[PDB]
Write a protein that binds this ligand. Structure first.
Ligand SMILES: O=C(Nc1ccc(Cl)cc1)c1cccc(S(=O)(=O)Nc2ccccc2C(=O)O)c1
Ligand SMILES: O=C(Nc1ccc(Cl)cc1)c1cccc(S(=O)(=O)Nc2ccccc2C(=O)O)c1
Lengths: 497, 497, 497, 497
């Protein structure tokens, strides 16, 4: 319906500029007829999820690259795609004028946008907050008499979550994660630094902390929000590290095992929220498979654990086969889920690089590699940040797919936004990854899935500068002949019956 | 009553530690006979408003600096001293347990504390808020039917103000200032940035903004709070600067002149709040005397303007005689009032330096300089902040005289608090500044005033590291022999008959 | 000869992109014939020192703005324009390929560029260095036996200075300034922080420090470089400030007075370098006129002081009339010279803003205001920086007129470069400022000067968004009719005989 | 000989203070009889390589962990230990007075110190340089007629290396690595950034770059220095990354394979320096085993490659078995060597933490892990840095075992220095790692080796805070009863007959 308004900030590609009265958008979903395929294309040159349609051919000759669907090779089913409603994201969004707020929310959660169906919600403060607080800061309030949601929840996060759900056609799942407990539950008496829960699993400190989870879910349910899942702790390894700068709460794998078995599992199970799923780890994949082995080899913990949540940040230190792959082999019935991802990275680079094509490619490359190693969902980090990558009370600025410019009542949709959308818009919940085999060595990343209705979706990212002629074979329909431009990302869709 | 509990955090002096059950405090005042003086002393070495007495004698033993009272030289009368009940200050105070809250409020407002009699109240959000909002964010509501106070006012600010007034030694005057209007009244449609009211004075946008002042005063009057004064805009010059990040609303001096003459003046005068005073500028003294000349040489604006409000960034240097002095010389019948002061952080220092004696001296030096240049009152910025100088949704740059540590139910009284108190506790409303003659060049800052009852008060700040032998002469009583220790601050009081 | 290659980085205007094989450049100077005028125009829209010529008219009618030359009102003569060859600047320049280095140096120092004729040279390290060092770091080497120039001088600064002088058609003057002494000469034993020379003027510490100046000049003269001037210390007030973060050496005005009278003056005068000029202050103008009064009222110091050097950084705190104007009135025969200027400023803004028109306007506005208040020369700060504003060992990053992109063998000429050039290219040494009177209130900054040969030059900066029709009257030639576009800067030249 | 002079800077342990006249040192080694062991102990509490002796007894009194020597299990032989003579290290050493310089050099290279026998020498500039340069910056000199060594080599590095060799206990091996080629040989024409050699292996650019290695070895041989080895490129992968800020030269594994096979191998083999070894990779272990597979499965490249050089960023985590282990398994006849290690700063810590015990333990843990995965030598990065971690022309991120304070003619020996020394002093070239069996799970890191003369050496690092009772068994001698204090590091040595 409305095209990208491009703006260069001097980097490799353009952002799409939105404001109170204008934002690029899609037309309502259309579907290609049998014998035809749909193609969505984004390019560093500036194309943004442009739609085209081609014929499926009966024959193919040539020595060119062929990607053959293996529809009977069936793997994981997808839970969904989304991002995090941090204090920083909600503050930035609500600082825009109301019409601009609605265009930003529709960009993410509408079928006119990219169809997010997951929102991750911090349990009280994290580094992407402007102040440190928990829900129960009265010292030694073991009964949690003074547990309460502050305005960050009641005036920022919760109203935006309601509005996202109203705009979404797809059912949206909420995921919650805590960063720190109240300081009076901690060995170090501080929100950050090295420190764990006082005492030992089963004791008053651990029972109070497990009840804090239930109190959080109770409070959100009073605001008519229900959670699909919670994680046991954001980045439990961080609170094992001297001087760790952000809110944290350290657990060894054994401490997490015993906390889940004795306290969190049973307390959640005996609550009205017993159907909320519990995810373990919520940390860098290099902690796998060991963390999964420690927790899940104890049946009194394993019975409460639905899944394993991973973060992308340190992916470069550990191969995905040795971490995700081996974890799946050991525990095939325990889903893997990517609970946090982000790019404000290289030290010679700014936290926010408006128009960076490379950071978009980093997202799509990680999503494809995750899908090939059994991951069922992805939540990005901050849904929106300001041009500095904030606010953040420790100045740990990073990038975000949408950058808000409050002084101009403007927001910018980054290449990351469209790279994410090439998956989130076209891979609904229940889609199952299937096999896809290449005829020759190539510089492409590709993944195939089948929708619940049987239709096919393939995403292709060209990591190279070179255009790559390519054919996709579906023995059900025929041959899809196409070209992957260098530094492009394509999503292909076609019916099989 | 109760002495300071000192604690050092590695800076040049100590803070005084208060909690739910303990805070340093004063006994009720006690007036010694003619021939005796009272001294209150605070020192970098750790003395905190410690009381002593001594004689005023007929013979002069000193041979050093003489300061002679000249009570027949009469200058301005004092309106008072206080600070700002920002969202941040209120949030921090209310994070303490109720007994701790009351000790903090008594510290500022009680005769057990330092006797503040001014509170400055932001009209809706500013940078020391946890979110952006105005009282009328629903757009295109020019009659302001949907004007309303949010929880920041009805739950945080107004109850705290009521409690301060209940505790107050003296009648407290309230002062209101707006940061931004609803953004649908602004040229840039944003809460911050370079932007003014749309249109021109007299038109629907300016009439609506003047009505917004009346709606605000109406709302607070429904909660049984009456204002002594309002400023025309906080920092009007800031909204003329591209990219200005805090909530703002830009006015040139000519725009403010015409807004006052056509819209704000008449509208307030035609309301039940016609007795509320209106102060102009509310900005850095650098803008004087020009801003005063522009506004006050127009009789249709001048008739509505009671005074000129000035801000102080206490870290910088500027020219008081050239700004405050020359403004008084040109407009001697228009009071000068300091509506905001704070000690920023030089870029190499933290926002909050617990125990900084230097930041305390910057306060007392500023107050003395102001009193010597005809200023009638002095209002601090945030009454309380957390240890990071927040919450602030944009950036933490300033300190506060009271720092709250929520996680320990404690608050710290900084040297700034006592340097303020050496004036606020001992200079009631209606006190008059009078002459004080130094007999020779010296390193002290000093000012003399007369209480309404005719008794004397002299404040002496020693900027230098050296003890200074000092004599103070009252022609009516005799000679007060004393010593001003290096870095110290003293308040002397004595009956004159 | 070669036009600007424009590139936007998303700010208000464009940079001009240069590399090893291309840089925008001028044709050799041309001169308009009597009855005609030359106009150079730069605009936010992207014009860069574009040349045009018009007729001088005999008559003029209208109520429009008229600027009338007052050629017999004669003021100061100009020394020149340039910038600082810091370690950071030289490192950045020499990291480019050799052909690119030459295009960058010609941009500044050639008649194909903007004709710089001053270079300021730090005496050893400052904040725009990658390491702290002095020329004499052996402790207690009062004889300066181990005084030596490091590679920063011999391999970076000195070779670039030689090459700039070779490219310059105009004679270039060098100005030197120290930041710190060796630490063993200082009360605090550190390169930064609060600290002055040990002892008292006339003693061994002060004699050694004065001899260090002579040793520096000796060493540079062995490399065939001679200095026009030295300053007594960069920013002497900075070393009076607790925690000052960069290299510094504190002097009160009295200490500087006595150091010059007893040590620096006589030591320089008795050296082979006795013709080098000595400038005092080299600090913010707010220290004037007091600093000038203290130093120059002592005839034993005044006899050695040629001039007063000022920095722009804190100009906003003190009016130029009260500082520069009053200093000129008191000491009319002691030249005023702007020894440092820079813009990496507002806290909500990046250190480097590629293409910022506003920062260019800030330069031209300051140069005009300086010229109107008797200043004879201007040296910008760093001649070139990287895109972060560095390197700088304390991360005190700021902007620069040329930004080097080493990875791309590219450099960017900022709007500041062209705003500077509108003065430096067209105001040779010996030009005398003359009177220029406006017919009506206007939003223009303008300054007129006469070249040694009698020709006229006028620079006009339009601070407003609005085009301003304008006439300039020279009773010698006639009327120059023109328009100043909004946000433009023009230089006009015409012969008078 | 002389003990440590401890000084604390607020971190977890002390540094040892050395100056012109004092540095801690060792007596000449002394070998006790069969049945006696020597222990050298360093502790967080402040012991520094303190020597004690005790008995190896026939009876075992301990009941805790047993470590049993298995001398018939023989693994790799050790080449040695050392560090890098960067421009920065040389500048820092030469800033000391000559007597202090000699104590620093003896600390590293003397039997009075820790017996280093490897020095890594950059071929021209890197980030730890004060300027950019290569040996052939004059462009288009393909025969390299203008190749020459600058003062960094002839004045700083080469004289220091000669002095180190004069002092050295043992024959010292020199190892050379280039960061960038002359930029006129590079695709991007810049010293850093994403860029490789122009053209393809075998052509004039690659032939010239291989000749550059021979010219470098020629030049150093003229100064009577011979190299044991050279690496093909420092960090070849870094030059494949857009924006990489340090000097670099990018090679894919295939490009390195073909460069070695066609140009560098043959050229070195045809020179008088044919005996110099060539090491491949010189990069992070993450690139293994892939990089090794690509290069070493090509026989025309493999015949020139003596070993694989690896880097360690000691702050991160990675997988040694998956990289070093698997590379040894696949290429068991190709030695592994650690060519660079350093402890970066987590973003919340300073580059240099004077006295950090943790950074010391990171060194000894890395060395033990390497020795257990077949690595034959371990080379630190900068031998010395200043207190800010410089000089570095790009950024300061890493610590160094010796920190020089020029302004006090002193240098500080960090815990890193002694943790290194527990290996370097006691493991001469030709020592062989042998088996050591732990009797039960434990928290110690330990490794055993045999000197060429057959005596034993065992290093034991206690990562935990708890004292660990320990027994060490030599089947040939008996039982050594000891205790490993929490955090400590011990080296044990004993004769076996
Ligand atoms: O030395 C004086 N001041 C002073 C100096 C140093 C320090 Cl530490 C403290 C005080 C002083 C000097 C002359 C007259 C008076 S005065 O008492 O007659 N006051 C005045 C008289 C005429 C105009 C203005 C005033 C006014 O007080 O502003 C006071
Ligand atoms: O417990 C052992 N190690 C150890 C554990 C903990 C600590 Cl703290 C220190 C040492 C060990 C176990 C089995 C065999 C051997 S071995 O001595 O026979 N060595 C080997 C035998 C076969 C293959 C490889 C090796 C090799 O040493 O790498 C050593």
């Amino acid at each position: 319906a409305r095209p990208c308004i491009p703006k260069s900030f001097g980097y490799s590609s353009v952002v799409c500029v939105c404001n109170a009265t204008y934002c690029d958008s899609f037309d309502p979903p259309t579907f290609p007829a049998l014998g035809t395929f749909s193609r969505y294309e984004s390019t560093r040159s500036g194309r943004r999820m442009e739609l085209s349609m081609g014929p499926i051919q009966a024959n193919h000759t040539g020595t060119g690259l062929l990607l053959t669907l293996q529809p009977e090779q069936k793997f994981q089913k997808v839970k969904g795609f989304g991002g995090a409603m941090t204090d920083a994201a909600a503050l930035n969004i609500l600082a825009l004028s109301p019409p601009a707020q609605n265009l930003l929310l529709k960009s993410y959660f509408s079928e006119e946008g990219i169809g997010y169906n997951i929102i991750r919600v911090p349990m009280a403060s994290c580094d992407f907050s402007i102040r440190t607080y928990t829900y129960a800061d009265t010292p030694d309030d073991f009964q949690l008499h003074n547990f309460s949601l502050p305005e960050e929840d009641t005036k920022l996060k919760i109203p935006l979550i309601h509005r996202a759900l109203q705009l979404a056609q797809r059912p949206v799942s909420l995921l919650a994660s805590p960063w720190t407990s109240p300081t009076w539950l901690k060995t170090n008496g501080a929100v950050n630094g090295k420190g764990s829960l006082k005492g030992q699993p089963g004791d008053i400190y651990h029972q109070t902390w497990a009840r804090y989870f239930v109190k959080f879910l109770d409070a959100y349910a009073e605001h008519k929000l229900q959670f699909w899942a919670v994680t046991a702790e954001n980045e439990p390894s961080a609170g094992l590290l001297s001087g760790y700068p952000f809110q944290c709460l350290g657990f060894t794998p054994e401490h997490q095992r015993d906390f889940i078995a004795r306290d969190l599992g049973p307390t959640l199970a005996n609550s009205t929220h017993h159907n909320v799923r519990l995810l373990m780890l919520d940390d860098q994949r290099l902690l796998l498979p060991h963390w999964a082995k420690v927790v899940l080899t104890d049946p009194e913990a394993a019975k409460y654990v639905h899944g394993i949540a991973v973060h992308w940040y340190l992916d470069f230190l550990a191969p995905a086969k040795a971490t995700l792959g081996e974890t799946h082999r050991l525990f095939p019935n325990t889903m893997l889920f990517a609970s946090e991802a982000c790019v404000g990275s290289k030290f010679w680079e700014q936290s926010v690089r408006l128009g960076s094509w490379d950071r978009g490619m980093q997202y799509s490359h990680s999503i494809i590699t995750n899908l090939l190693y059994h991951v069922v969902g992805w939540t990005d980090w901050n849904l929106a940040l300001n041009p500095e990558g904030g606010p953040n009370w420790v100045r740990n600025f990073v990038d975000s797919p949408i950058i808000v410019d409050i002084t101009k009542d403007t927001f910018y949709k980054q290449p990351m936004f469209y790279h994410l959308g090439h998956f989130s818009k076209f891979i609904p919940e229940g889609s199952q990854r299937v096999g896809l085999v290449a005829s020759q060595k190539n510089d492409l990343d590709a993944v195939a899935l089948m929708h619940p209705d049987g239709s096919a979706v393939v995403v292709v990212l060209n990591r190279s500068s070179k255009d790559v002629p390519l054919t996709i074979k579906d023995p059900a329909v025929g041959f899809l002949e196409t070209i992957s431009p260098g530094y492009s990302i394509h999503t292909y869709l076609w019916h099989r019956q």
